[PDB]
Amino acid sequence: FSKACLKNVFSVLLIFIYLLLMAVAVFLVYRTITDFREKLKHPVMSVSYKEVDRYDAPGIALYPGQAQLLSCKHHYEVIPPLTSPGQPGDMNCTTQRINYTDPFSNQTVKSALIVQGPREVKKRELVFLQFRLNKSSEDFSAIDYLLFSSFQEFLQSPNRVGFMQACESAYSSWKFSGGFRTWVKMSLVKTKEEDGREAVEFRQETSVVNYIDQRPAAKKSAQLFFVVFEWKDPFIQKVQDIVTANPWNTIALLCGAFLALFKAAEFAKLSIKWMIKIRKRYL
Amino acid sequence: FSKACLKNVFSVLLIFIYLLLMAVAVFLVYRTITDFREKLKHPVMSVSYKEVDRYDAPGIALYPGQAQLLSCKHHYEVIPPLTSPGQPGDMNCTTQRINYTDPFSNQTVKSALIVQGPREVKKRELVFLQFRLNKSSEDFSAIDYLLFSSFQEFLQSPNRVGFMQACESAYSSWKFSGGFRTWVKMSLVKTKEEDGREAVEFRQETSVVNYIDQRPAAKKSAQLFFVVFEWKDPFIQKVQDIVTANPWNTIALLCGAFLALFKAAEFAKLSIKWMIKIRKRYL
């Protein structure tokens, strides 16, 4: 039967058309919900992890001040013994020197030394830094450092000063002591704001290790700073609005609501007929 | 047609009534599920973050023991250089002194100094504390401290002693060393128990910094304790039962199940008619 086959194929096509129409309606309702959500402030946010084979190269903005960088080197899961503490050399890191006004206190300019961070988390790649300071007039010996998402973004940024101020606004600033080697295991946390930008903040697990110096007492006045940066785990924590992070839950809820509405329509159509029949039988 | 319009509006009203009835049934089923869940112990819990513009003022319960508080001051994202280490003055913090019996070991009473914590996370507000100890007979120089949810709750609590014991039961106790300035970046984690109470625990990221003292050798016997408390990020981690944390997923699942049951009812109504017709045709 050619007519029967034509009717069947047209019915299948109409099934496709109505399924597409329902999908479009659900998508429009979900987009309306998202647009209404993004307006309100402080929404409930969910957590999602995503393992990465290789990390993007981060930026480690040091603040030596009067301290001089002594040595920078990349290593894998082990630190070879130092040839001679307090001596320069063996320095090759992608270091960019920029200094700018502090966004918090506009009166002070801070000198930032940005060093490209490790990126092969699987190989336990780490970066070892050494600093020296002959004379210091301060109660506490420390160097400030903050971590931002990517070194490449800073390198190719059009407004370098503003990018560093935005990084200062981010909550990823710490310190490492003098006379100690601190192993910093940094973790990446990405949060997506409602406006669209993805703010990035870091989490660290320091391991302070005392440094024993056999150098002559003449050079004991100078203090040596050591720090090691390494990725703790390949997993990247992602924070996003609970509705937007997993839209499939909202889609399922909306489909359930629409199907419930249609079932209620069918129930009303049956019930009006039933009550009309009852009224006709009674009177 | 007045009758047609009346029938249509009555049908819409009946749609509303049946939709409300379905919502009530789904709500009752969800409440039954929640009541059954809350009985079982150790449920699977989810994680939700919620950014806050301003933090509630926390309580930092120090345990100086023989140590004397030297100076307390609130600062913003920077610590001014100390005028004179080891000297009192410039002390203004909301400090409440209470001491009580240890819930773990009832034989020992512990002296707790509670200091109101920072609350403007956006401005990077921080609290700086100094302690002094002339003579000490101990292998390790440290001061215990634990953090609870709100200082105001402790201040207006009816049973002060019991509140501190409950805080001791909470897992938010740490230490900071002597001769070092430790920057404590505390994070708030709220977990909601099945009974209804919301237990609060803290997460910290210390940054130990060595302290260099130029004071005369006569006063070197006394040891100085420094600590800084600051909120790491405005986000507050919230932990709740997976079913209760996002009830919309359970509501969607229940609506889907009810609609599937109704579809099965329709399928049975069609299939019984089909098989009756088949049986009548055959015999």
Add this chain to the structure above:
Amino acid sequence: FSKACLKNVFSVLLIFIYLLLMAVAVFLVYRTITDFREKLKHPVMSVSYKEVDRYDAPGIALYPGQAQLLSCKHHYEVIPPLTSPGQPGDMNCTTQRINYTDPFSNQTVKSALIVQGPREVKKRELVFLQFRLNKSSEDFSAIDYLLFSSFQEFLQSPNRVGFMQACESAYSSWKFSGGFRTWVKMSLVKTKEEDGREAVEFRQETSVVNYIDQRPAAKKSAQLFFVVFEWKDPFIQKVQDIVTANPWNTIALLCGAFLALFKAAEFAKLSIKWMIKIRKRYL
């Protein structure tokens, strides 16, 4: 009416049969989705917490090297003052000594001392370790340690060497300094891979505390290492694929999709009749 009751009970049985068939179809579709997901690499993973009354005993693999273990003891929420620093005795921990080749650098063999960790988190059980080293030729004084999921698994493992290499592959290695007592608050994080194995990694919150020594200057050459291990909180972080972690969301979405397809089928059946009637009326 016996016939009416028989028809009703048969209709109920057919309802059960069709509900079971729908459940089987949804289960097959969900299993297909899971099998397709598990093939792709780097999926989005969710976070679930689960409180435990008691922890499984972990394994703390120390790396003293030339250092000699001085004392091991289990305590509850308090460390009694040391009877005499630098002296052995009071040693009773379940310690297993194994040494093997480093998976990263095959040329070096590492000596591992595994100590059973605390398990009563509710009682704040902790393990205190002491180490001694007379002569050392190294710039930094530290002992490596890594934490794996269970001590019992290592104890009864058939291939001990391979298990330790797998633990080394896990990202749970840290250090503790010399001359300081570091309080390690370890947290358990379980991640389930797509292949099926559950990798385990740890998170720690160290609390470095300076150690004051009154021992005679003759013995000051030797350095003493102190470390304390304790569970931070009973909650265990579990990381799993977002689809697999909460299958109920996927089941609800699939049921909604199938019900939407059936509703589209009904709409097509009505619309074809409506358009056929319209065409017949027109021509």
